[PDB]
Design a protein around this motif. Structure first.
Motif, PDB file in Angstrom:
ATOM      1  N   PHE A  19       0.803  -1.217   0.000  1.00  0.00           N
ATOM      2  CA  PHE A  19       0.000   0.000   0.000  1.00  0.00           C
ATOM      3  C   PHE A  19       0.842   1.276   0.000  1.00  0.00           C
ATOM      4  O   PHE A  19       0.536   2.242  -0.704  1.00  0.00           O
ATOM      5  CB  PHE A  19      -1.007   0.004   1.144  1.00  0.00           C
ATOM      6  CG  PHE A  19      -2.350  -0.511   0.744  1.00  0.00           C
ATOM      7  CD1 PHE A  19      -2.625  -1.885   0.793  1.00  0.00           C
ATOM      8  CD2 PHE A  19      -3.335   0.364   0.282  1.00  0.00           C
ATOM      9  CE1 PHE A  19      -3.876  -2.383   0.413  1.00  0.00           C
ATOM     10  CE2 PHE A  19      -4.589  -0.117  -0.107  1.00  0.00           C
ATOM     11  CZ  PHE A  19      -4.862  -1.497  -0.040  1.00  0.00           C
ATOM     12  N   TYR A  68       2.805   1.651  -3.639  1.00  0.00           N
ATOM     13  CA  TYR A  68       1.895   1.978  -4.724  1.00  0.00           C
ATOM     14  C   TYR A  68       1.097   3.235  -4.437  1.00  0.00           C
ATOM     15  O   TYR A  68       0.621   3.874  -5.365  1.00  0.00           O
ATOM     16  CB  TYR A  68       0.981   0.806  -5.075  1.00  0.00           C
ATOM     17  CG  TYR A  68       1.683  -0.303  -5.826  1.00  0.00           C
ATOM     18  CD1 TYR A  68       2.740  -0.027  -6.684  1.00  0.00           C
ATOM     19  CD2 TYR A  68       1.304  -1.634  -5.667  1.00  0.00           C
ATOM     20  CE1 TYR A  68       3.388  -1.046  -7.374  1.00  0.00           C
ATOM     21  CE2 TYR A  68       1.951  -2.655  -6.355  1.00  0.00           C
ATOM     22  CZ  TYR A  68       2.985  -2.354  -7.207  1.00  0.00           C
ATOM     23  OH  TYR A  68       3.620  -3.364  -7.889  1.00  0.00           O
ATOM     24  N   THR A 105      -2.825   4.074 -12.724  1.00  0.00           N
ATOM     25  CA  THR A 105      -3.770   4.046 -11.617  1.00  0.00           C
ATOM     26  C   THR A 105      -4.647   2.796 -11.726  1.00  0.00           C
ATOM     27  O   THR A 105      -4.684   1.983 -10.810  1.00  0.00           O
ATOM     28  CB  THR A 105      -4.595   5.349 -11.524  1.00  0.00           C
ATOM     29  OG1 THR A 105      -3.711   6.431 -11.221  1.00  0.00           O
ATOM     30  CG2 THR A 105      -5.633   5.266 -10.422  1.00  0.00           C
TER      31      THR A 105
HETATM   32  C1  BOG Z   1      -1.400   1.783  -2.778  1.00  0.00           C
HETATM   33  C2  BOG Z   1      -2.876   2.129  -2.875  1.00  0.00           C
HETATM   34  C3  BOG Z   1      -3.051   3.054  -4.066  1.00  0.00           C
HETATM   35  C4  BOG Z   1      -4.519   3.440  -4.170  1.00  0.00           C
HETATM   36  C5  BOG Z   1      -4.655   4.386  -5.341  1.00  0.00           C
HETATM   37  C6  BOG Z   1      -6.096   4.818  -5.439  1.00  0.00           C
HETATM   38  C7  BOG Z   1      -6.158   5.760  -6.611  1.00  0.00           C
HETATM   39  C8  BOG Z   1      -7.561   6.308  -6.854  1.00  0.00           C
HETATM   40  O1  BOG Z   1      -7.401   7.122  -8.019  1.00  0.00           O
HETATM   41  C9  BOG Z   1      -8.555   7.545  -8.761  1.00  0.00           C
HETATM   42  O2  BOG Z   1      -8.089   8.120 -10.000  1.00  0.00           O
HETATM   43  C10 BOG Z   1      -9.159   8.589 -10.852  1.00  0.00           C
HETATM   44  C11 BOG Z   1      -8.598   9.129 -12.179  1.00  0.00           C
HETATM   45  O3  BOG Z   1      -7.882   8.085 -12.861  1.00  0.00           O
HETATM   46  C12 BOG Z   1      -9.971   9.659 -10.114  1.00  0.00           C
HETATM   47  O4  BOG Z   1     -11.008  10.159 -10.975  1.00  0.00           O
HETATM   48  C13 BOG Z   1     -10.559   9.036  -8.820  1.00  0.00           C
HETATM   49  O5  BOG Z   1     -11.386   9.980  -8.084  1.00  0.00           O
HETATM   50  C14 BOG Z   1      -9.408   8.542  -7.944  1.00  0.00           C
HETATM   51  O6  BOG Z   1      -9.883   7.941  -6.714  1.00  0.00           O
END
Ligand code: BOG
Ligand SMILES: *[C@@H]1O[C@H](CO)[C@@H](O[C@@H]2O[C@H](CO)[C@@H](O[C@@H]3O[C@H](CO[C@H]4O[C@H](CO)[C@@H](O)[C@H](O)[C@@H]4O)[C@@H](O)[C@H](O[C@H]4O[C@H](CO)[C@@H](O)[C@H](O)[C@@H]4O)[C@@H]3O)[C@H](O)[C@H]2NC(C)=O)[C@H](O)[C@H]1NC(C)=O
Ligand SMILES: *[C@@H]1O[C@H](CO)[C@@H](O[C@@H]2O[C@H](CO)[C@@H](O[C@@H]3O[C@H](CO[C@H]4O[C@H](CO)[C@@H](O)[C@H](O)[C@@H]4O)[C@@H](O)[C@H](O[C@H]4O[C@H](CO)[C@@H](O)[C@H](O)[C@@H]4O)[C@@H]3O)[C@H](O)[C@H]2NC(C)=O)[C@H](O)[C@H]1NC(C)=O
Ligand code: PEF
Ligand code: PEF
Ligand code: LPP
Ligand code: LPP
Ligand code: RET
Ligand code: RET
Ligand code: BOG
Ligand code: PLM
Ligand code: PLM
Ligand code: PLM
Ligand code: PLM
Lengths: 11, 326, 326, 11
Positions: free
Chosen positions: B220, B223, B251
């Motif tokens: 966690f 990343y 992402t």
């Molecule tokens: C190690 C854990 C990492 C968790 C990463 C969570 C990332 C959430 O990333 C997401 O990206 C989107 C755009 O691509 C946004 O529109 C969302 O609101 C956002 O929550």
């Protein structure tokens, strides 16, 4: 970042 | 009082009727219909059919493609070797024994399967951790003037083997033990029996803390840092459409990678914990069968995620499979 | 004299020991170990796990993508519907009965499974034929001033259903018959017993000539003409690198498509023929089990070839599977 | 041919 990303197989 | 005990085992069925037998000695057709043993075998067959081509091919393709043999890919190969221990150490032994209805290889077989099977799925787990660490180092550039090379790759791999031995080895020598679990056809670690002569309780914790929470936190963190570093680099240059896609694909992947890690270990944790904290309760073989269903199928869905979805690897595979062309 | 006969069946085992029982009434654990019945079930499980997602997804994806709904694709959807009859008509029934060790649904179940299972694999076969015909018409332009439209697509599909009924229907009403085959867990057509009351011999021929040789010839002709028309169009314009690739990919595919058609029906033909011409010989259940292994696995490898390798289809699938993106 | 090939899913 794009070049490090590619190397990682991430993008 | 729910089970029947014996020297190296614990059948989750009551001997009040006097039908219970050693899982090392006779079919357990009272724990579950014979058709449910067949279905167990059906499944093992599935994981061998799917898990062995996918994992082996990965190794094979790396041999045919020079561009795959880079440091950032050692841990991914490690992951595929680990899955193969799961397939041969675990799945094929369980295929065979399930077709008898009991663990025909005796206590030695139990230790053996148990060790290799456990050994395989821990190298995998730690591979996944090591990977996130490497990916965070290389991209988030946390250390200045540092460049990830072949000698870090190797340590990374070896650290993975050492952490696995750090839990596959103990039960062979006194701290916890291997015994048939569930329908008694496969030997796992004992985490559901309070067996003071081996100290099951303390091990269960140590596995929980070191081999579950630690990995979870690290993954966690790394990343998190990475979806952060990339979301920021993209804000600071919105004039690049490419840099915008890159941040969105990274992402999507991190989400997939994290969710799949939970699907694999969360059940085992959820059960281990709930057993630990409801010690006066009866748990069925099929209740023990569930977390093992999830953790074992990762020998298929892990290569799909970390290999079949890795652009470099995917292409070489398609090439190799289509006879050298395309 | 090798088998044991009965009103609606033929067990390939000798009753001299007096152990043989109706496949509609009791386990056949003397034809084959119980573990071999489990393995049979393992396999059916595999074909259901692989065959149902792949075939169903095809249908689903066509619903999400407007560009897939063109006449030249009706027959490919037909192919996927046919495979689904194989999966549910055939494979799941056999999964269930194999886990008993005999055909628990009786003669009606036998007719039913037999009909749908047979019905599914013939629509598939004829789909593959119809397809080559369409592909030859459209590309080789054999008729002048003709353009393939939606009403030809429909006839094509319907011709496929009619040809299937032309062999699924007869055994239900007197020309040949359905009976458990091999290990008695699945009901096929009787082509290995000379059962004069239904005229098995003549049917076996008619199936051989009409539902095997004809299809083979047509496929070979159409794809011959086509690898010809394309190899020529490419010779007559070598200044196009694209036209050169196109001719090489089309050849590679036609080879793959033909070889896979043989792998599917050749065994069944090879056996049918050799049985017909060695009528004084004993054939084991596992000898009958082989050609059915090859023909049934086509409910997986056919969609892989005609769908997962079709550029249009493949992309829409990847889109749908990756949550709308990519 | 290339346009008839594409339509057929052949190329
Ligand atoms: C190690 C854990 C990492 C968790 C990463 C969570 C990332 C959430 O990333 C997401 O990206 C989107 C755009 O691509 C946004 O529109 C969302 O609101 C956002 O929550
Ligand atoms: C779960 O529950 C069952 C039942 O309690 C246990 O099975 C019993 O195990 C004992 C031994 O630990 C077996 O005892 C042996 O019986 C044999 C012959 O006895 C016959 O008659 C019995 C009725 O008692 C029948 O049911 C049985 O089928 C036999 O035909 C002998 O070989 C043995 O005699 C020897 O040992 C005894 C000491 O126990 C001495 O008195 C004799 O001198 C001699 O040394 C022995 O008696 C018993 O037969 C089993 N019963 C059943 C129903 O199988 C399981 O062990 C238990 N499971 C687990 C996991 O531990
Ligand atoms: C493959 O081979 C076996 C053996 O030849 C066949 O099984 C036999 O089938 C016959 C009937 O067709 C069964 O006959 C019936 O026996 C019953 C009771 O008999 C007991 O004693 C016998 C020894 O003969 C034991 O082996 C058995 O377990 C029994 O406990 C009765 O219910 C029947 O009696 C009735 O029918 C007879 C006519 O045959 C009359 O004389 C009586 O008045 C009454 O009407 C009958 O006799 C026989 O038991 C079966 N034997 C075995 C070994 O199972 C299979 O049919 C054959 N398989 C196929 C595919 O067809
Ligand atoms: C009757 C059949 C005649 C022809 C047989 C041909 C067999 C050819 C192949 C070799 C068989 C060797 C069997 C040796 C053991 C034996 O048979 O040991 C007899 C004992 C049974 O005894 P049991 O029931 O009392 O106890 C046992 C509890 N009820 O086996 C067993 O439980 C073991 C069975 C082990 C099966 C391993 C299967 C591995 C399958 C790999 C994949 C195959 C895929 C096919 C995919 C389509
Ligand atoms: C002891 C277990 C207790 C808990 C059981 C929980 C069961 C929960 C689920 C529902 C079970 C209903 C059983 C009804 C029939 C019965 O049981 O009928 C008892 C009879 C056996 O009798 P027999 O052996 O004399 O004869 C038979 C010849 N030897 O079945 C049967 O042969 C039929 C078995 C049919 C099995 C169908 C399986 C379909 C599987 C789908 C996929 C599952 C995938 C899992 C993947 C990981
Ligand atoms: C981590 C927390 C992230 C926060 C959001 C969570 C919800 C997702 C979201 O935001 O939204 C998820 C979106 C959904 O797409 P739309 O909402 O645009 O339709 O896209 C995704 O990336 C979903 C992928 C995650 C789930 C699939 C991967 C699971 C792992 C595969 C293993 C399967 C094996 C099982 C066999 C037994
Ligand atoms: C038709 C006759 C064509 C003439 C040549 C035949 C030999 C091939 C050749 O020339 O050469 C074949 C070449 C081989 O490549 P190289 O020779 O360049 O290495 O390329 C191919 O196209 C081979 C593909 C055919 C075989 C694979 C497809 C089989 C069908 C898949 C079904 C699998 C399911 C099985 C599960 C039970
Ligand atoms: C990960 C983990 C645990 C145990 C996992 C086990 C015991 C897995 C065993 C798998 C084996 C041994 C397979 C053999 O085929 C605990 C301690 C329950 C706590 C939660 C974290
Ligand atoms: C194609 C063909 C034949 C028969 C094929 C059969 C009988 C297939 C049956 C499949 C079924 C019925 C499956 C049911 O689950 C013959 C006549 C042997 C001759 C060779 C051509
Ligand atoms: C309907 C049956 C069609 C069979 C088509 C066989 C086509 C063989 O086509 C092959 O094409 C190659 C170039 O791509 C040549 O180099 C080979 O010599 C040639 O055999
Ligand atoms: C180049 O021509 C590649 C040729 C080989 C492709 C082989 C594909 C095998 C696919 C098995 C797919 C199973 C999908 C299961 C979904 C549940
Ligand atoms: C070289 O170009 C060969 C290319 C084509 C390979 C096509 C392979 C299709 C395989 C489908 C799955 C078959 C096995 C199914 C087992 C259940
Ligand atoms: C977009 O993100 C696509 C996501 C889903 C990919 C699912 C892949 C499942 C693959 C099963 C493969 C089995 C291969 C068997 C070879 C014998
Ligand atoms: C939306 O973007 C979701 C994308 C990722 C899906 C990944 C699916 C991997 C599936 C692997 C096979 C799992 C089942 C194995 C059964 C034996």
């Amino acid at each position: 970042i794009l070049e490090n990303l590619k190397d990682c197989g991430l993008f | 009082m729910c089970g029947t005990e014996g020297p190296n085992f614990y059948v989750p069925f009551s001997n009040k009727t006097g039908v219970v037998r050693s899982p090392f000695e006779a079919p357990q057709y009272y724990l579950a219909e014979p058709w449910q043993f067949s279905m167990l075998a059906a499944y093992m067959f599935l994981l061998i059919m799917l898990g062995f081509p996918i994992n082996f091919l990965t190794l094979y393709v790396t041999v045919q493609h020079k561009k795959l043999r880079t440091p950032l890919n050692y841990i991914l190969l490690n992951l595929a070797v680990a899955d193969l221990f799961m397939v041969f150490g675990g799945f094929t032994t369980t295929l065979y024994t399930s077709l008898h209805g009991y663990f025909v290889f005796g206590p030695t077989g139990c230790n053996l399967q148990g060790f290799f099977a456990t050994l395989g799925g821990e190298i995998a787990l730690w591979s996944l951790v090591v990977l996130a660490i490497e990916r965070y180092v290389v991209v988030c550039k946390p250390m200045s003037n540092f460049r990830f090379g072949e000698n870090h790759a190797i340590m990374g791999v070896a650290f993975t083997w050492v952490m696995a031995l750090a839990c596959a080895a103990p039960p062979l020598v006194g701290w916890s033990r291997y015994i048939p679990e569930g329908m008694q056809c496969s030997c796992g670690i004992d985490y559901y029996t309070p067996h003071e002569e081996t100290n099951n309780e303390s091990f269960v914790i140590y596995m929980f803390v070191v081999h579950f929470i630690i990995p979870l936190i690290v993954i966690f963190f790394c990343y998190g840092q990475l979806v952060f570093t990339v979301k920021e680099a993209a804000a600071q240059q919105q004039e690049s459409a490419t840099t915008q896609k890159a941040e969105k694909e990274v992402t999507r992947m991190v989400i997939i990678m994290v969710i799949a890690f939970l699907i694999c270990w969360l059940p085992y944790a959820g059960v281990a914990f709930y057993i630990f904290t409801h010690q006066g309760s009866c748990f069925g073989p099929i209740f023990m069968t569930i977390p093992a269903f999830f953790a074992k199928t990762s020998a298929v869905y892990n290569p799909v995620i970390y290999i079949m979805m890795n652009k470099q690897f995917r292409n070489c595979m398609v090439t190799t499979l289509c006879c050298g062309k395309n």
